[PDB]
Design a protein around this ligand. Structure first.
Ligand code: LDA
Ligand code: LDA
Ligand code: LDA
Ligand code: LDA
Ligand code: LDA
Ligand code: LDA
Lengths: 34, 34
């Protein structure tokens, strides 16, 4: 986002967000399986 | 945001975001001091 500034912070944030999205995906796959 | 889910991730994200905002603040204070 902010150009090439805050590489480290932006990568940590992206990490956690991907973790969250993955767990929400797992949950929805258990809610409506297939 | 997502209720009480993802306490740990949400806290890490908040940490990094506050770091970023603080550094941007410092920068703007050097750009227009007072
Ligand atoms: C108007 C917003 C200005 C954003 C520029 C802030 C520059 C701060 C530089 C901190 C260093 C970040 N770095 C390169 C380690 O990622
Ligand atoms: C203050 C908002 C922070 C935004 C966080 C953006 C996370 C990007 C994670 C790495 C992936 C970015 N990339 C390389 C696809 O552009
Ligand atoms: C609000 C937290 C940060 C949001 C970051 C969103 C990044 C979405 C994933 C980037 C897509 C990269 N990909 C794999 C298509 O190349
Ligand atoms: C429609 C979105 C549904 C979101 C609910 C996902 C539940 C996943 C539970 C993972 C556990 C999270 N916890 C409690 C450790 O923070
Ligand atoms: C996927 C988006 C993540 C949103 C991150 C929200 C960070 C909140 C940081 C802790 C502060 C929240 N609080 C307690 C003021 O509500
Ligand atoms: C996109 C990354 C997450 C953004 C989190 C934004 C939180 C702003 C700070 C919350 C304000 C809490 N306070 C100190 C007024 O009580």
């Amino acid at each position: 986002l902010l150009g090439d500034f805050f590489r480290k912070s932006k990568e940590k944030i992206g990490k956690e967000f991907k973790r969250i999205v993955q767990r929400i995906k797992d949950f929805l796959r258990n809610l409506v399986p297939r």
